[PDB]
Amino acid sequence: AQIDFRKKINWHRRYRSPQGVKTEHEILRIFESDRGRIINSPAIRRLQQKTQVFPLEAAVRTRLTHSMEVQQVGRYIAKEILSRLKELKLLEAYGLDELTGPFESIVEMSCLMHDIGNPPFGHFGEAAINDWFRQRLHPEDAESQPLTDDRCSVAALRLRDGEEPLNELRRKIRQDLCHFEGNAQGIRLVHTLMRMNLTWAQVGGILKYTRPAWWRGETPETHHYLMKKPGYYLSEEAYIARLRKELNLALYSRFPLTWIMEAADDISYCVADLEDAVEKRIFTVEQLYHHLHEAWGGSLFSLVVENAWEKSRSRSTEDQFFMYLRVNTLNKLVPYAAQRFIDNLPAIFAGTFNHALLEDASECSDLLKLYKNVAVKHVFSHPDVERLELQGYRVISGLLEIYRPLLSLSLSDFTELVEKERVKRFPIESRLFHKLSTRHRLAYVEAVSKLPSDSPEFPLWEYYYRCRLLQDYISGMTDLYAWDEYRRLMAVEQ
Amino acid sequence: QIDFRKKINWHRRYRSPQGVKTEHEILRIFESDRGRIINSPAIRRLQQKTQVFPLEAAVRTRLTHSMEVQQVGRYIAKEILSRLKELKLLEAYGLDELTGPFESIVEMSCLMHDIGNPPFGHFGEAAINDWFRQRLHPEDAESQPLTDDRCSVAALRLRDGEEPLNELRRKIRQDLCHFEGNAQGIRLVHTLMRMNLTWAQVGGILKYTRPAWWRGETPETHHYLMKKPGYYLSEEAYIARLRKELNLALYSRFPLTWIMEAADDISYCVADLEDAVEKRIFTVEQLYHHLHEAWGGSLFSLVVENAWEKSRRSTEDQFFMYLRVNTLNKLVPYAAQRFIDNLPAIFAGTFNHALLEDASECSDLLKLYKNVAVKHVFSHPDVERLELQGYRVISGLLEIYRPLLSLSLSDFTELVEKERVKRFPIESRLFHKLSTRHRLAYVEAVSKLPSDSPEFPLWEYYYRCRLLQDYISGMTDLYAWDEYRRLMAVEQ
Ligand code: NI
Ligand code: NI
């Protein structure tokens, strides 16, 4: 092989693509166009009110501010990597000499969008959606040979005896629909839903996992880490294939700048969650310092944490302590992350590298695990947080049940509903339908129209795309919007 | 005579970097600035102060707006630097090793451009000033001591024969009635949050150069830079040191500011229109017609009509994508060109115009967006009601804390020192409710004073009022509203 980043940092687009030879400048302007597209997308503002950890009530992080923090850390790691590469006289050799700006920016924006796909109430929205679609589709009963009391409630998707091609499609659909995941939904959102038409490189930095959502069974040994969670849905399959071709990815391989983004997320996530914890008066700073000292056991802790504490004891103490905790943490981990990226650059470039930059038995990872431990033991277990998670789960389950009658309809009927807009014998599901976002309905019409109308696959694909539509609509909501819809449609408030 | 090494100053007020530095070490310093800002509570507090509409999610907040402005500022900065490189002027102006810093300072100046604003924005302003006017009446201190001086504070009332003390009284009364977002921003970044930014960075926040205590007309040659107050009587010393570190003449301004300002103008106009359509006030076609009518190969044809033609994904999104893109592709180059064309004056910090404020077609496009906005959006009864409400809320909080300002020096001082005073239950608890940061700022400032001087009661009262304004202006919309409701015993 060889490391030529010109072959990875691909400034083409899916639609209306830039063509031909380009100035270093023209390339830069393209990736800046990407920045504009993202910073101005509704998806991002929607982040400015999805909950991070605490109920919104102002100084507490939201998905947005967290994403901005991650962006900053990503920038710092990218800059350290590029700078070390310049000191190693390796920048030209790796084809990065005219792509430093793009490199940096792709990382920054990949960070900003790392949460773009998450549904309201985060991992509990996820939980709610998957659990609901599991109770309706039971993918576990499609694992092997057709079960004679197949628990799935959808006639079309139930495994029928003798028709193994159709049965395989049924299998994939049922598994896929029960594996909604923030990142996969993120790819879907950026491409099919918002139609942002980013550069291939930029979309690549969003693809954080490489397992198909419809995946059943164990993951390959050699790819365990990159396939921890679903990375793309059955729908984006074609798209993801083209993406692989444009970014020179082997199957289940990942874009490199992703590894960078990931590391940034880990760092920011840990430290910030602790600071917010102190801000919500859960524990004082001293209490935090003791929990850390105890949960640990010239070492790293001494440097980062104990020096942060000593600085803190000689502006406001909470702010001083956390300023220097952040600073010291970053000054230890960011160089390490950079060093790991470079040391492992062949594998990371290939996109096959089966570890995180930080996931280790290295002291650095242990520091991160320390923050995460204190967080999960003394913050995420707090009754107000837990209550909010419970509530969110009820709200999303509730909405899904409210729109159930859209998924109850036969192909004939639902299609009639799409075409006539307002159906006389179907008042409720007509109005339920109108309540779906035009963006999402459009995506449905678009996807269904591209189908072989007479093929036996059609009812299956249609049902899939219809469920896909409903999940699009729900996952697209902010916490407050989802909660509010739930309350109004339950006729609890006007 | 343009040496940007003399403006892009990487020193700090406290614990400053000293000596010779690598281009890299300089970069790392300005990145440290970025970190300090992006992680400051002030910025998240922006993620819920209202921009135009009530929070209810797709609508802009002070934060998202600030991010949009940041992007436009970055683009303008890059265009300026790039045009300077094409003119072979980059080395000559001392920017060849400061391109990263240049860009970054602009970006962050943008992100912080709203950091100072009080809850409910210009109506919080209104409320604060109007309240302190009813209490201090600066208009009665304009000239010679008035014998029925309407001011209700014994110490600050103009007394006959004592013209030095009278001048101090004059400045204090005028200053306290001229609370302004930007001045409060300087105060916030420096005295309150103690962020200790670089001088250059603080400089990009200083948008106006008129002292808050200014009375009478502004100089002819500086009319534009002194439209609004830029710094309070307290930050006076600080601002002086800032002038020395950034090589500013009196009432002169930092350059990168002009850039930030232009970014604000652009993204503010376009965005407000988009959000207007999102809140279903008018459709896209309705908007296009309001624009076409309110106008009159020209610019409109290019930017707006081409946006509309492209528009005919979702139509609202397509139209606004290309409206934003075309607008930027016209105005950002122009802004850059204006910055460079006028670089001597802008560098000096004396340039008496905005990059965009003109009779130039570009400014007219902006004025067009602003006109359609102010006529068909800001006049919408729901916006107006929110402004009215906000003014009531801030006026209400100020009245609620009034008894802290009613106390004598002796008594209020006793309150500060003993923390809980037995004969003063209410004002004790009111006092405890003030943020420790703000109270600390008060103690800090008062302790530095000549304890026996006749100026002391005056300065103390000033700093006390300063304290209360710090606390109120520091709130988010929702927090201020909520405090007003709870302290009125309307909700538990
Ligand atoms: Ni995250
Ligand atoms: Ni603004």
Min Cα–Cα distance to chain A from B194, Å: 6
In a 10 Å sphere around its CB, with 0-12 CB exposed, 13-18 middle and 19+ buried, how is residue A162 labelled? exposed
Chain A to chain B, count of Cβ pairs less than 8 Å apart?
A: 96
Domain B1-117+178-253 -> CATH class: mainly alpha
Kind and range of the H or E run holding B230: strand B229-231
A interface toward B at CB cutoff 8 Å? 25, 32, 35-37, 39-40, 42, 44-46, 48-49, 56, 58-62, 64-65, 68-69, 71-72, 75-76, 79, 83, 194-195, 315-316, 319, 323, 326-327, 330, 438-439, 442, 478, 480-481
Please state, as a whole number, how many other Cβ atoms lie within 10 Å of the Cβ of residue A314.
Answer: 6
The residues pairing with B229 across neighbouring beta strands, listed in sequence order, are B210
Query: Is the distance from CB of B479 to CB of B433 less than 8 angstroms?
Result: no
Residue B405 to residue B403: CA distance in whole angstroms: 5
Neighbours of B469 (CB within 10 A): 22
B440/A316 touch (CB, cutoff 8 Å), yes or no: yes
Interface test with A, best of B12, B43, B67 (most A CBs within 10 A): B67
Phi, psi of B12, deg, nearest 5:
-120, 160
User: Measured at the alpha carbon of residue B441, what is the angle toward residues B435 and B443, in degrees to the nearest 5?
Assistant: 105
State which residue of chain B sits closest to A315, comparing Cα positions.
B194
Token digits for A344? 């492992």
DSSP output for B332-348? HHHHHHHHHHTHHHHHH
**CA atoms of A12 and A20, how far apart (whole Å):** 10
- The Cα angle at residue A192 between residues A191 and A197, in degrees rounded to 5: 35
CB B140 within 8 A of CB B158: yes
3-state secondary structure chain A: CCCCHHHCCCCCECCCCCCCCCCHHHHHHHHHHHHHHHHCCHHHHHHCCCECCCCCCCCCCEHHHHHHHHHHHHHHHHHHHHHHHHHCCCCCCCCCCCCHHHHHHHHHHHHHCCCCCCCCCCHHHHHHHHHHHHHHHCHHHHCCCCCCCCCCCCHHHCCCCCCHHHHHHHHHHHHHHCCCCHHHHHHHHHHHHCCCCCEHHHHHCCCCCCEECCCCCCCCHHHCCCCCCEEECCCCHHHHHHHHHHHCCCCCCCCHHHHHHHHHHHHHHHHHHHHHHHHCCCCCHHHHHHHHHHHHCCCHHHHHHHHHHHHHCCCCHHHHHHHHHHHHHHHHHHHHHHHHHHHCHHHHHHCCCCCCCCCCCCHHHHHHHHHHHHHHHHCCCCHHHHHHHHHHHHHHHHHHHHHHHHHHCCHHHHHHHHHHCCCCCCHHHHHHHHHCCHHHHHHHHHHHHCCCCCCCCHHHHHHHHHHHHHHHHHHCCCHHHHHHHHHHHCCCCC
Cross-strand bridge partners of residue B180: none
DSSP character for B219? P
CB neighbour list of residue B489: distance below 8 Å, 6 or more residues apart: none
H-helix or E-strand containing B273?
helix B255-278
**φ, ψ dihedrals at A231, nearest 5°:** -120, -20
Measured distance CA(B53)–CA(B394) in Å, rounded: 18
Q: Which residues of B touch A (CB under 8 A)?
A: 24, 31-32, 34-36, 38-39, 41, 43-45, 47-48, 55, 57-61, 63-64, 67-68, 71, 75, 78, 82, 193-194, 313-314, 317, 321, 324-325, 328, 436-437, 440, 476, 478-479
What is the CA(B399)–ligand 1 centre distance, in A? 43
Token duo for residue A433: 């339908």
Q: What is the dihedral of CA B211, B394, B467, B405, to 10 degrees?
A: 110
CA distance B43 to chain A (A): 8
Taken in order B352, B355, B361, B365, the sign of the CA dihedral is negative
CA B289 to chain centre: 34
- Which residues, in sequence order, are CB contacts of B6 under 8 Å at separation 6+? B94, B247
Nearest residue, CB atoms, B38 vs list A48, A72, A316: A72
Contact at CB, A58 and B45, closer than 8 angstroms: yes
Q: Return the number of other C-beta atoms located less than 10 Å from residue A203's C-beta.
A: 28
3 state SS for B378-423:
CCCHHHHHHHHHHHHHHHHHHHHHHHHHHCCHHHHHHHHHHCCCCC
User: Helices A317-343 and A363-378 meet at what angle, rounded to 10?
Assistant: 140
Angle (deg, nearest 10), helices B99-111 and B255-278? 50
* Residue A322: partners with Cβ closer than 8 Å, 6 or more residues away: A271, A274, A275, A278, A308
One-letter amino acid of B368: L
Return the half-sphere exposure (C-beta side, CA atoms, 13 A cut-off) of residue A302: 2
Looking at the annotation, which residues of A are catalytic?
A: 66, 114-115, 265, 431
Contact A194/A39 with Cβ under 8 angstroms?
Answer: no
CA B178, B184, B186, B190 torsion-angle sign: positive
Handedness of CA A180, A184, A188, A194 (dihedral sign): positive
Measured in Å, residue A64 CA sits from the centre of ligand 1 at 10
Residues in chain B: 492
Token pair in block for residue B264: 């604000």
- Domain residue ranges of chain A, discontinuous segments joined by +: 1-118+179-254, 119-178+380-494, 255-379
SS3 B99: helix
Question: Can you tell me whether residue B155 is helix, strand or coil?
Answer: helix
CA A322 and chain centroid, separation: 27
| Closest ligand to residue B111's CA | 2
- Per DSSP, B424 falls in state -
CA of B286 to the centre of ligand 2 (A): 26
Geometric angle at alpha carbon B340, from B252 and B230, rounded to 5°: 25
Residue A190 near residue A198 (C-beta atoms within 8 A)? yes
Ligand 1 centroid from CA A115, angstroms: 6
Chain centre distance of CA A311: 37
The pair of three-digit structure tokens given for residue B488, joined into one six-digit string: 């009125």
The Cα B234–Cα B188 span in angstroms is 12
B272 backbone φψ class: left, alpha, beta (φ>0; ψ -120 to 50): alpha
Identify the three-state secondary structure at position B426.
helix
Experimental approach? X-ray
CATH 3.10.580.10 fits domain A1-118+179-254? no
CA of B53 to the centre of ligand 2 (A): 14
Q: Quick check: A69 and B38 CB within 8 A? A: yes
In angstroms, how far apart are the furthest CA atoms of chain A? Answer: 77
Q: Is B254 helix (H, G, I), strand (E, B) or coil?
A: coil
